[PDB]
């Protein structure tokens, strides 16, 4: 099966459960562990469910 997946831009792990996305940039995603690191500082990240 070949499918589109959401991959964490902080650690390359799967983004499952809560998905953090940049409020400004398209195609930016963090898992909940990496969001706690504060990555992509300067842009607010938004909490969403994951696909
Ligand atoms: Zn991560
Ligand atoms: Zn951004």
Author numbering: -3 to 47
Please quote the paper that reports this structure.
Intriguingly, the autophagy adapter p62/SQSTM1/Sequestosome-1 was recently reported to recognize N-degrons, the N-end rule substrates of the well-characterized UPS, and where ultimately these substrates are delivered to ALS8,9. p62 is a key selective autophagy adapter that plays a role in the degradation of various cellular constituents such as misfolded proteins and their aggregates, malfunctioning organelles, and invading pathogens. Intriguingly, it was recently reported that the central ZZ-domain in p62 plays a critical role in the recognition of N-terminal arginylated BiP/GRP78 by the Arg-tRNA transferase ATE1.
Therefore, we determined the structure of the ZZ-domain in complex with a variety of N-degrons comprising three type-1 N-degrons and five type-2 N-degrons. However, the side chain of the N-terminal residue of the N-degron is recognized differently. Furthermore, the hydrophobic side chain of Ile127 guides the orientation of the side chain of the primary residue. Therefore, relatively small and branched hydrophobic residues at the primary position might provide very weak (or no) interactions with the binding patch of the ZZ-domain.
